[PDB]
PDB file of C-alpha atoms in Angstrom:
ATOM      1  CA  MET A   1      24.700-106.607  -8.568  1.00 54.56           C
ATOM      2  CA  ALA A   2      28.057-105.316  -7.326  1.00 56.28           C
ATOM      3  CA  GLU A   3      29.850-102.462  -5.565  1.00 57.03           C
ATOM      4  CA  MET A   4      29.523 -99.992  -8.451  1.00 54.80           C
ATOM      5  CA  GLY A   5      31.532 -97.313  -6.670  1.00 54.03           C
ATOM      6  CA  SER A   6      33.215 -94.509  -8.603  1.00 54.72           C
ATOM      7  CA  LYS A   7      32.949 -96.720 -11.677  1.00 52.79           C
ATOM      8  CA  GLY A   8      29.197 -96.701 -12.265  1.00 53.81           C
ATOM      9  CA  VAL A   9      28.657 -93.148 -11.031  1.00 53.20           C
ATOM     10  CA  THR A  10      31.368 -91.847 -13.364  1.00 53.02           C
ATOM     11  CA  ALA A  11      31.151 -94.001 -16.499  1.00 51.64           C
ATOM     12  CA  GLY A  12      27.385 -93.712 -16.202  1.00 50.00           C
ATOM     13  CA  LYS A  13      27.621 -89.963 -16.690  1.00 49.32           C
ATOM     14  CA  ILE A  14      29.466 -90.396 -19.989  1.00 50.60           C
ATOM     15  CA  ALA A  15      26.820 -92.775 -21.345  1.00 51.11           C
ATOM     16  CA  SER A  16      24.043 -90.258 -20.755  1.00 48.69           C
ATOM     17  CA  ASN A  17      26.260 -87.484 -22.134  1.00 47.13           C
ATOM     18  CA  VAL A  18      27.145 -89.222 -25.397  1.00 47.17           C
ATOM     19  CA  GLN A  19      23.471 -90.116 -25.743  1.00 47.01           C
ATOM     20  CA  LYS A  20      22.701 -86.410 -26.126  1.00 45.28           C
ATOM     21  CA  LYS A  21      25.125 -86.242 -29.041  1.00 48.09           C
ATOM     22  CA  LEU A  22      23.286 -89.103 -30.744  1.00 46.95           C
ATOM     23  CA  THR A  23      19.895 -87.475 -30.280  1.00 49.47           C
ATOM     24  CA  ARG A  24      21.324 -84.234 -31.664  1.00 46.61           C
ATOM     25  CA  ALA A  25      22.600 -86.107 -34.704  1.00 47.56           C
ATOM     26  CA  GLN A  26      19.050 -87.248 -35.442  1.00 47.91           C
ATOM     27  CA  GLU A  27      17.632 -83.730 -35.372  1.00 48.49           C
ATOM     28  CA  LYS A  28      20.614 -82.524 -37.413  1.00 50.37           C
ATOM     29  CA  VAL A  29      20.235 -85.075 -40.225  1.00 51.32           C
ATOM     30  CA  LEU A  30      16.733 -83.710 -40.773  1.00 55.85           C
ATOM     31  CA  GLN A  31      18.452 -80.516 -41.911  1.00 57.12           C
ATOM     32  CA  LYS A  32      20.093 -82.541 -44.678  1.00 56.06           C
ATOM     33  CA  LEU A  33      16.883 -84.248 -45.802  1.00 53.66           C
ATOM     34  CA  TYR A  34      14.130 -81.770 -44.950  1.00 53.72           C
TER      35      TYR A  34
END
């Protein structure tokens, strides 16, 4: 554990955000195959 001030609350938002882009990639590749 630690302080996790504006570091975890901020950088944590980017992680979740980029995650969406990865999930979108998965659904998009299906367009190439299927």
